[PDB]
């Protein structure tokens, strides 16, 4: 009888956004990044920084009352590297193990379908 947010993890390079929004996707709850859990401008995309970012996101998410998450992982996509970075599976795994049910894992990287390079 749980209640679901969606995760909207952005596992870019050089950073890692995680903000669990509401089920519609409109009212965002507790944005943290991977750059406000360590401060050196180098390790701000590390798996450890991403996973502890995910830890305190799960803290504020349980504060609100959302107990389970549809997770949507997003790479930088488009005309760029198109693979999820280092912090994505780390943040997903941390959100899994920190007392938060996970359903419907999904990759929402934006495929180009012939974007511009020429």
């Amino acid at each position: 009888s749980q209640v679901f947010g969606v995760a909207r993890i952005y596992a870019s390079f050089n950073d890692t956004f995680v903000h669990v929004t509401d089920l519609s996707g409109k009212e965002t709850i507790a944005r943290v990044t991977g750059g406000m859990k360590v401060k050196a401008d180098r390790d701000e995309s590390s798996p450890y920084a991403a996973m502890l970012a995910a830890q305190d996101v799960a803290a504020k998410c349980k504060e609100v009352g959302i107990t389970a998450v549809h997770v949507k992982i997003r790479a930088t996509g488009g005309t760029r590297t198109k693979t999820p970075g280092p912090g994505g599976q780390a943040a997903l795994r941390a959100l899994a193990r920190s007392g938060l049910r996970i359903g419907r894992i999904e990759d929402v990287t934006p495929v180009p379908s012939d974007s511009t390079r020429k």
Binding site: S46, P47, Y48, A90, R93, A94, R97
Partner: protein, 171 residues
């Protein structure tokens, strides 16, 4: 209420070894009507017709994490601890010598961690399981992530001295 707990086939045979010394410290004491589904590799603990379900659940959850029976009875007693798992992720260069820096030699650096911060840790080839006090888990995880991020063993021994004094001395 009931609870199932999955078990893997690498703690299954020692669970059959210690099977005679868990439910006699459980069912007469912390009742929890018990089955063991070998058909799907789970352990079933259902309620009593005559909140101990959480205690029995994380009892055998610490066992399938792979801690000693002394630690599992130390989880029955002292109901304030915490189990914790984290895997490294930070292939050879960043796996083999990293877990070598964790273990030191013969588990002596792991032993320094454990005796410094009063926790109990175990580890597989990749994962790390730490149980004990909460601030101790925080501090031990901090020292371990320091030395897998890359620090001299003498410098994390100095950090170990400071944290052992802080968490074995009052206030």
């Amino acid at each position: 209420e009931s609870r199932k707990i999955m078990v893997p086939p690498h703690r299954m045979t020692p669970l059959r070894n210690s099977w005679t010394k868990i439910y006699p410290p459980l069912v007469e004491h912390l009742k929890l009507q018990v089955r063991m589904n070998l058909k799907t590799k789970s352990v079933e603990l259902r309620t009593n017709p005559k909140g101990a379900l959480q205690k029995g659940a994380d009892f055998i959850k610490a066992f399938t994490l792979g801690f000693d029976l002394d630690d599992s009875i130390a989880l029955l007693r002292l109901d304030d601890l915490y189990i914790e798992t984290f895997e490294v992720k930070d292939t050879g260069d960043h796996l083999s010598r990293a877990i070598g820096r964790i273990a030191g030699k013969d588990g002596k650096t792991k032993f320094a961690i454990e005796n410094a911060t009063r926790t109990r840790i175990v580890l597989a080839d990749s994962k790390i399981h730490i149980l004990g006090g909460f601030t101790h888990i925080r501090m031990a995880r901090e020292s371990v992530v320091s030395l897998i991020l890359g620090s001299p063993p003498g410098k994390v021994y100095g950090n170990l001295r400071t944290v052992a004094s802080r968490l074995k001395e009052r206030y």
